[PDB]
Amino acid sequence: PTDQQVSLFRYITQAVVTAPRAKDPANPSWHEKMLMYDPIILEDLTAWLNSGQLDRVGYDGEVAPGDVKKWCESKSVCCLWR
Amino acid sequence: QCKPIPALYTVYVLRSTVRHASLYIGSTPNPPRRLKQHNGLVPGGARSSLRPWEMVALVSGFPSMVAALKFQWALTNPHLSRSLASVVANLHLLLRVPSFARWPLRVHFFRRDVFAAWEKWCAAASERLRPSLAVVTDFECWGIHALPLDYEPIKDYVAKGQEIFEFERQGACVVCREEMASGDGLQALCTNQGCDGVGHLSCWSRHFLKDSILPVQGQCPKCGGEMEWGNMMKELTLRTRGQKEVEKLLKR
Ligand SMILES: [Zn+2]
Ligand SMILES: [Zn+2]
């Protein structure tokens, strides 16, 4: 919606969907968790996004949880605060 | 999440029969019991003056309780996003809002008056509602007492996976074609009976979406049938997490 988020959203999408799929079905990846309609704790996802997963897909800097929540809602991903 | 996709979770519009103008918006996985509580027959409800209440309509298929509550609050508060006219119109917009547009939802109406307002509003609607969003009616067991509260409507589907994955008949993925080992990642099974096509979970999503993260509708590569992403996940999560829930279903 905002002119600056639209760039950040393309990266957040990338980092989530390019992360390696899980080899253990009990501990799925973040992309797989959204696929199965899991409620997504924003603190956990935002922290994972700042672990180095955004530097991998070419976004230097840091993301705020509110920006991540707006990402989830644009993709119909169920999310919630902790 | 640690529990499988609930067998049923609804967001309902409750109306008084004493006063047709009094509406109430809650949620429950068991509409008959919650209606019994709203009418004092079962302990647990929130004012007899307006009893007995009725469920004129409800939205079903919320893949998690969290999701159903995110929706319930969003409809009790349209000023941050009263009457049957506004409830019907707010419901129509929320179903197009991106935060809920791709959820495995079904809209149920139970009163010809309330369903009439829905059609009156859809006739003037700005955007058309997504055709995958089933809007069904059920007037005058009927109504809410027809909705299946358990996992029975997918009993055979669940039994199919219990065979394919217990005996390692999973075969090779039907998208990437690479041979999948047993318990090697999340492997999602097709829904249509007679077919045993299995694939890696992220491969189906890649396939259904040919921009987006969450699939909605799609066709099977092996058998050519059509599936809704909600059902395929309701079985995957049932198999991954709900081992106890599966046993009670098949009497095992
Ligand atoms: Zn695959
Ligand atoms: Zn098939």
Author numbering:
A (entry chain D): 844 to 925
B (entry chain C): 4 to 49, 54 to 88, 114 to 172, 197 to 266, 271 to 312
Question: What text comes from the article?
Answer:
When bound to SLX4, SLX1 cleaves various branched DNA substrates near the branch point. The CCD3 fragment of Slx4 bound between these two domains.
We obtained two crystal forms of Slx1–Slx4CCD3 from Thielavia terrestris (Tt-Slx1–Slx4CCD3, where CCD3 corresponds to a previously characterized Candida glabrata construct). Crystals of Tt-Slx1–Slx4CCD3 that were obtained in the presence of HJs were found to be crystals of protein alone. These apo crystals crystallized in the C 2 space group and diffracted X-rays to a resolution of 3.1 Å. The phases were determined using single-wavelength anomalous diffraction (SAD) for zinc ions at a wavelength of 1.2828 Å. The main difference between them was the connection between the GIY-YIG and RING domains.
